[PDB]
Design an enzyme around this catalytic site. Sequence first.
Site, short mmCIF file in Angstrom:
data_model
loop_
_atom_site.label_atom_id
_atom_site.label_comp_id
_atom_site.label_asym_id
_atom_site.label_seq_id
_atom_site.Cartn_x
_atom_site.Cartn_y
_atom_site.Cartn_z
N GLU A 38 0.84 -1.21 0.00
CA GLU A 38 0.00 0.00 0.00
C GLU A 38 0.87 1.26 0.00
O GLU A 38 0.84 2.06 0.95
CB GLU A 38 -0.99 0.02 1.18
CG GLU A 38 -1.86 -1.23 1.32
CD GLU A 38 -2.95 -1.32 0.27
OE1 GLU A 38 -3.17 -2.43 -0.25
OE2 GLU A 38 -3.60 -0.29 -0.03
N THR A 57 -0.01 0.72 -8.67
CA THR A 57 -0.62 1.86 -9.35
C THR A 57 0.33 2.40 -10.43
O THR A 57 -0.11 2.70 -11.54
CB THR A 57 -1.03 2.99 -8.37
OG1 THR A 57 -1.91 2.45 -7.37
CG2 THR A 57 -1.77 4.12 -9.09
N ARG A 107 -8.60 -2.57 -7.04
CA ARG A 107 -7.66 -3.34 -6.23
C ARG A 107 -7.84 -4.85 -6.41
O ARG A 107 -8.81 -5.43 -5.92
CB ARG A 107 -7.81 -2.95 -4.75
CG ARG A 107 -7.64 -1.45 -4.49
CD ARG A 107 -8.06 -1.08 -3.08
NE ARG A 107 -7.48 -1.97 -2.09
CZ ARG A 107 -6.25 -1.87 -1.61
NH1 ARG A 107 -5.44 -0.90 -2.01
NH2 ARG A 107 -5.81 -2.74 -0.71
N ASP A 131 7.02 -5.83 -10.61
CA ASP A 131 6.45 -5.65 -9.28
C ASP A 131 6.17 -7.00 -8.63
O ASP A 131 5.43 -7.82 -9.17
CB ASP A 131 5.16 -4.83 -9.33
CG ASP A 131 4.62 -4.49 -7.94
OD1 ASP A 131 5.32 -4.75 -6.94
OD2 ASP A 131 3.49 -3.97 -7.86
N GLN A 149 2.96 -10.81 -2.57
CA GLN A 149 3.22 -12.23 -2.72
C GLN A 149 4.55 -12.56 -2.04
O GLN A 149 5.60 -12.03 -2.42
CB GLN A 149 3.27 -12.60 -4.21
CG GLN A 149 3.57 -14.08 -4.50
CD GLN A 149 2.33 -14.95 -4.58
OE1 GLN A 149 1.43 -14.85 -3.75
NE2 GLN A 149 2.29 -15.82 -5.58
#
EC number: 3.6.5.-
Lengths: 39, 316
Positions: free
Chosen positions: B12, B17, B147, B169, B173
């Site tokens: 976050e 994004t 999301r 990215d 995970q």
Amino acid sequence: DIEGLVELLNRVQSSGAHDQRGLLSNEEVFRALRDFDRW
Amino acid sequence: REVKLLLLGAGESGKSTIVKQMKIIHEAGYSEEECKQYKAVVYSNTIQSIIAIIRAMGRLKIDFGDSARADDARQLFVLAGAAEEGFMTAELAGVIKRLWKDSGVQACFNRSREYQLNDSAAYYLNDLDRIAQPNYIPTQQDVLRTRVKTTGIVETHFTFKDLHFKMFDVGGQRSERKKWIHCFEGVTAIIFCVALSDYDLVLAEDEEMNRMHESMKLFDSICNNKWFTDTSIILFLNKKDLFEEKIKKSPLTICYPEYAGSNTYEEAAAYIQCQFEDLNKRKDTKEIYTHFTCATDTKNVQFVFDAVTDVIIKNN
Ligand SMILES: Nc1nc2c(ncn2[C@@H]2O[C@H](COP(=O)(O)OP(=O)(O)O)[C@@H](O)[C@H]2O)c(=O)[nH]1
């Protein structure tokens, strides 16, 4: 080592809010309700 | 030539994004056909957001503003499942609408620093009248705010200023050590993301330092690693929009109790910048390229990535 990185990396990168990503599943709505039934 | 970019940083912060932004800027963007796909997840995130606030009212002992909302809450759980991945009834729209407009739910929403509420929550709930309409197709900006559950590694290809870009990215995970190496090998530049607005988040029972200092302790490792000496370290201090609004009411002294400066956005922003930049043990061999970004702001990201590309150009 370059190992102490890997441990703290996928801890910190897996932070943040959850039950907020992806498609809304019935198991998710159930646990939401179960909680709601106390306060 | 070929340029490999690895996105890193706390969950976050902006990573996923940014990858989406590259598609919007340097690729075709999102087709109307691809936008329909997300209608499902838009509704999913909307409901997930309102749920998360309701839930947090439990921990924070915040009662409903209006007594009647408890029944609307109950209706939400009954109707939610029937948000069958591409259909929001006017019945359900009203339910969410009424909850989000509730004095108490708001009181809790404003205290989103005391729990973990996604930053796409307010974006959707304020736009219900638009989202709820039967013939709605998610806008470019809407798809950006969706999301989805992270899987393994996310990747994007694009050509910009005669360069073949490959952006990676991995975050969220919990990846194998040997799958991490595949991401470090031959990386041109790291784009580490930091959520400025994370400064006021209140500590959980498991953690032993505030979130900003956790993002710091990670940076202190990425920045000073033997693997990354001939690697450009780009730092996006993201969520500057929220950070500016937050700093109006919650002092940066919540996060750095030793901070003696004023609670202006500009001074605090610059102070945080110093904190991450100072973790660089090698100033005689290395320099950190810092940008104050707003990842959801396509225009801003375009400018910033442009400046980032120019750095990569004269560093090859
Ligand atoms: N208001 C605002 N929201 C943001 C900004 N950057 C990211 N977000 C939102 O907050 C979340 C950030 O996490 P995201 O990039 O999606 O995944 P990540 O890889 O864990 O950072 C997303 O829901 C974004 O829509 C920002 O600069 N301003």
